[PDB]
C-alpha cells in the first residue's frame, strides 16, 4: 500500500534528460555517490555499486523510451522495505528547456513504520534529484 | 509492410523469457547475430551478422512481466525503412511450453513489398526455428 512521489524541474529540455537519465545502466552518469553500474542478463539487471564497494541489485520491469520513463524493482538492497516498485519519468517541463522529473515508488514497509520508509525512500528520490539538477547546472 | 510468424517453444515462459528478454541476449540464441554489445546504458545494441555487416538497434519498449521489448533499428543491410519490431513471449499450450512471436512493421526501399517481408519474415522464422531447436538439447 505505501507509496511516495517527488517532482522537480530540471533545468533541461525533456530530450537532453532523458538522453543521460534514461539508461538504465547509466545512475553513475548522474550520480555522484554512485562510482559505478554494470549489467547483467543481457541488460535487465543493474549492479549498482556505492563508494563501499557494497553494491545493490535491480530489475528492469518496464522501459519506454518515447514516453520516457523505466520501472525496476530491488532484487538486492539494504533498505526496509519490500514489493519495491520505483519509476522514474521524464515529463514536460514548462519550457522547452526545462523538464518535470518525477520519481515515484510503492513499497511495503519491513521492521520500520509506513512514515520511516516513505521519509528514507523519499529523500532517496529527493537527493537523486538534486543531483540531477547540479549535473546541469554543469 | 508488416509479416508475423510464432513458434511453440519447449519451455516454461520463464524459462523462455529468461533466454531471450535480455536486449544483449541474441548471441545466445540467434545464430544470425553471433555478436552483441550494448551503448546508452543498454538502450542501443551493436551487432554483427554472420557476414560481419554491422547493425545498431534502439530499445523502444521493454515489459517484464507482460514478457516482450519492442525495438527499431537504425543501421542494417536491409532493404527497409522506419522499420518497428516485436518479440514477445506468451502463454504456451501448456505450462512447460510458451507461444514465441516476432513480428514487425516496415516500409520496404527500392524492393518490392514481397522481397522485403521474404527478408524479414525469413531472418524471423529461422530465428524462432533455432530457438526451438536449443530447448530440445
Redesign the interface.
Given at each position: 500500500m505505501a507509496h511516495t512521489t517527488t517532482s522537480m524541474e530540471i533545468f533541461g529540455s525533456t530530450e537532453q534528460v532523458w538522453q543521460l537519465i534514461?539508461?538504465?545502466?547509466?545512475l553513475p552518469?548522474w550520480l555522484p555517490y554512485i562510482p559505478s553500474s554494470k549489467?547483467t542478463?543481457?541488460?535487465?539487471v543493474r549492479h549498482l555499486a556505492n563508494p563501499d564497494g557494497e553494491t545493490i541489485i535491480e530489475?528492469?520491469?518496464?522501459?519506454?523510451?518515447?514516453e520516457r520513463y523505466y520501472t525496476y524493482s530491488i532484487m538486492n538492497a539494504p533498505f526496509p522495505v519490500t514489493n519495491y516498485l520505483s519509476t522514474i519519468q521524464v515529463k514536460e517541463g514548462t519550457e522547452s528547456n526545462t523538464s518535470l522529473v518525477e520519481w515515484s515508488g510503492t513499497f511495503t514497509p519491513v521492521a520500520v513504520s509506513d512514515e520511516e520508509a516513505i521519509n528514507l525512500v523519499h529523500g532517496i528520490y529527493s537527493d537523486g534529484l538534486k543531483a540531477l539538477q547540479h549535473a546541469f547546472l554543469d
Open positions: 534514461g539508461g538504465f545502466n547509466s552518469d549489467l542478463e543481457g541488460g535487465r530489475r528492469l520491469e518496464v522501459f519506454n523510451d518515447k
